[PDB]
Design a protein around this ligand. Structure first.
Ligand SMILES: OC[C@H]1O[C@@H](O)[C@H](O)[C@@H](O)[C@@H]1O
Ligand SMILES: OC[C@H]1O[C@@H](O)[C@H](O)[C@@H](O)[C@@H]1O
Length: 428
């Protein structure tokens, strides 16, 4: 029971699929640095080659065409555009995205471009990365470059993927690149990511961009007990994970207490952060359990191969709660949803990933349930088109509609691919 003209897509990210890390003048990213360190990645892998989308993207565009998605969400590698994060653009970098976007348009696919999906140029990290306010300005300049090249052709833009992850995991506890562990010392990263968001929105509009939104991770936060310790920790986590990133964008304020902990002209910055958006993009996987706080899986649910709860009702609950908190929220696109399940091709070359079908089916139903309660949701993008490099978990977690063998680089559409193509057809 989805809206007429609901958009169906699929999503990837540059470092996770492209490979070709040293080709055509690409500069090192923080993820090149992180993956070169012993013990950072569970299986000792990197994004050196991964799916090798940089050389195999025609095949991938054709898979998207066969799938029949309305939209394809991809990320631009900043280090291919500006190897050091500043200075004149690398032509070969520009050429790659330019050609990709023209091919997507020939195939009748609406391109959704993410500017920042975590691959900061190392040269910018060397100067302090997102702890430096100046990084938000470098990001704004990069936005203008990509706006100038692609502005008239990209259907949708997402400046920053999951600023909450970049902040807490990258700089707060150091579980992801760049591996800093500042705890609350990471709050300035949040402010500069959000400032970067707002400046990029301006840059893209001035370049003639079409629709500009977000791609922020959101989850209902469930207290694991009744203890105040636990309800207060869950409230705190909700304030840090959800509100810290949505309140500034959608209301032009920080949650109570936070503005006074942020550097710079915060009031003026919040005007820059709160640029009007065409859509609000969110990434949803599952509710988060919480007990200054500790995050654990909510009990009682079946789990994916990543140990994550399968809890589609949490998506309905979230979409309803977001609409309550932010009545003026623009149309919502689900910019990512998906699941890790490890099955690969059997003796006959079939990948029977029925658990992935079940997950995606139930989540689409959860979107329909929120729509039925008056939530304005306009599309859904499956993470991912391809099995890919899952950050610190390497190649051990497969999220694809399409199986990728990392030795032969063969793509095999899974059962879920065929299922999704049928859903999309039925809905038209
Ligand atoms: O169940 C908790 C898990 O849920 C997920 O969706 C998050 O991405 C993980 O960071 C978290 O550990
Ligand atoms: O963890 C699974 C997926 O979660 C998302 O939040 C990220 O944007 C993806 O890059 C990642 O592969």
């Amino acid at each position: 029971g989805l809206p007429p003209g609901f958009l169906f897509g699929a999503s990837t990210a540059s470092y996770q699929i492209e490979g070709a890390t040293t080709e055509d003048g690409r500069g090192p990213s923080i993820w090149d640095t992180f993956t070169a360190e012993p013990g950072r990645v569970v299986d000792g892998s990197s994004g050196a080659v991964t799916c090798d989308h940089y050389h195999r993207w025609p095949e991938d565009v054709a898979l998207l065409r066969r799938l029949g998605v309305d939209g394809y969400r991809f990320s631009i590698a900043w280090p291919r555009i500006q190897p050091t994060g500043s200075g004149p653009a690398n032509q070969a970098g520009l050429d790659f995205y330019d050609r990709l976007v023209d091919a997507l348009l020939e195939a009748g696919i609406a391109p959704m471009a993410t500017l920042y999906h975590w691959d900061l140029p190392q040269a910018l990290e060397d100067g302090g990365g997102w702890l430096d306010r100046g990084t938000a300005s470098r990001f704004a300049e990069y936005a203008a470059i990509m706006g100038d090249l692609l502005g008239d052709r990209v259907a949708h833009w997402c400046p920053v993927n999951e600023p909450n992850v970049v902040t807490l995991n990258g700089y707060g506890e150091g579980s992801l690149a760049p591996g800093k562990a500042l705890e609350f010392g990471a709050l300035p990263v949040a402010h500069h990511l959000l400032l970067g968001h707002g400046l990029a929105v301006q840059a893209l509009r001035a370049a003639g961009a079409r629709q500009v939104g977000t791609a922020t991770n959101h989850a209902p936060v469930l207290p694991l007990s009744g203890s105040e310790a636990d309800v207060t920790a869950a409230s705190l986590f909700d304030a840090l994970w959800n509100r810290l990133f949505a309140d500034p964008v959608l209301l032009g304020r920080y949650p109570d207490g936070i503005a006074d902990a942020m550097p710079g002209p915060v009031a003026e910055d919040l005007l820059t952060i709160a640029q009007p958006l065409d859509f609000y993009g969110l990434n949803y996987y599952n509710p988060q359990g919480v007990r200054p706080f500790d995050v654990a899986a909510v009990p009682g649910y079946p789990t994916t191969d990543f140990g994550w709860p399968v809890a589609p009702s949490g998506l309905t609950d979230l979409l309803v709660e977001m609409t309550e908190r932010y009545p003026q929220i623009p149309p919502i696109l689900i910019t990512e949803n998906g699941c890790s399940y490890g099955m690969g091709p059997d003796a006959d070359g079939v990948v029977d990933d029925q658990p992935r079908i079940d997950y995606l089916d139930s989540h689409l139903g959860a979107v329909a349930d929120a729509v039925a309660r008056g939530v304005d949701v306009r599309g859904y993008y499956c993470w991912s088109l391809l099995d890919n490099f899952e950050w610190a978990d390497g190649f051990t977690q497969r999220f694809g509609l399409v199986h990728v063998d990392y030795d032969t680089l063969v793509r095999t559409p899974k059962r879920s691919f065929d299922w999704y193509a049928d859903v999309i057809r039925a809905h038209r």
